[PDB]
Design a protein around this ligand. Structure first.
Ligand SMILES: Nc1nc2c(ncn2[C@@H]2O[C@@H]3COP(=O)(O)O[C@@H]4[C@H](O)[C@@H](COP(=O)(O)O[C@@H]2[C@@H]3O)O[C@H]4n2cnc3c(N)ncnc32)c(=O)[nH]1
Lengths: 178, 183
């Protein structure tokens, strides 16, 4: 399936590369505002709505800083760069938490495939594959040599805004301190 | 299929983003940093597609006649809440009889590394036979996408080939030079 390939791709070509070094990059950051959480928070919107900017999703999520770049040779690209961003989460206009946060990039591929005629990929296919991506990725991480990351999958109906993405991420950050 | 998704992902998440500005980056490079009259960086991204899905981390180690020269000017952008994501491409010289015989922007197709890993990991349920079948389909699907894509305009060449990276007789530089010389 489309999702099977994307989940393996995201694990092999990204998470397996950045998660073993994440704990250390946060140290180089932390002590060198506000301790940043230790885990990479990965947002999995099942509708595959992935904006370039998180503040677009929720104005209470604001970019704060970049972690130091991780660079390395991969597939003939000398000094490929992987970068991650730290965001503050505001509550009543003030900072309530900070964490390394991003959307799962393969969900942009599912979205764009649903939009390109030649991909032969419907909106129903997109939802089914977004689900299968999440499940497949989770099953991989469950025995992947999880501790450095937290996956948050969620669905939001289209005509409906009872949803605060910043509040949900804050709930998770608070539970982890515990 | 697996290959369908991986080819679309390579297009959506990479080639559609880098191909529109590639020739401007190459022109900048040749105009300002490389005034060698027979040494101009070629105008297309050459993408290596080893059908056994053997992708080395270091392209130049697998041939003494491929030498890293420099990087193109970086391309940067915000994507999926990653600020200033960087897309980099490397320029290599291709040596023949000790001379610089070609110069090009060269890299392996990254999704092939995925097909290789899937064939290695039990949990992927993906055989070596599946891997060869999907590699071939990946190549076909990518060719069909690029043929219709507005971003692909004499600026990308796929180079598919059967030989293992641990060749002995096969020369990767010769394989690339043969295509460079046909344009
Ligand atoms: N050679 C090359 N290939 C790239 C590059 N960026 C992406 N690709 C490949 O294009 C496909 C889609 O990539 P995404 O960035 O949308 O999601 C890819 C994909 O889902 C998975 C595997 O990535 P790769 O092995 O590098 O190959 C990708 C992938 O085949 O990790 C994601 N990923 C890779 N780099 C990053 C990254 N830096 N930040 C967030 N996600 C990333 C790139 O910079 N150089």
């Amino acid at each position: 399936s489309v999702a099977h390939g994307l989940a393996w791709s995201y694990y092999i070509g990204y998470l397996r590369l950045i998660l073993p070094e994440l704990q250390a990059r946060i140290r180089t950051y932390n002590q060198h505002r506000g301790a940043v959480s230790q885990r990479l928070y990965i947002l999995l919107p099942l509708d595959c709505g992935v904006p370039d900017n998180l503040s677009m999703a929720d104005p209470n999520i604001r970019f704060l800083d970049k972690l130091p770049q991780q660079t390395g040779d991969h597939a003939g690209i000398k000094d490929r760069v992987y970068s991650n961003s730290i965001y503050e989460l505001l509550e009543n206009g003030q900072r309530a938490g900070t964490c390394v946060l991003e959307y799962a990039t393969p969900l942009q591929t599912l979205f764009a495939m649903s939009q390109y005629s030649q991909a032969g990929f419907s909106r129903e296919d997109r939802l089914e594959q977004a689900k299968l991506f999440c499940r497949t990725l989770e099953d991989i991480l469950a025995d992947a040599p999880q501790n450095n990351c937290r996956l948050i999958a969620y669905q939001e109906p289209a005509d409906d805004s009872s949803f605060s993405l910043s509040q949900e991420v804050l709930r998770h950050l608070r539970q982890e301190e515990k």
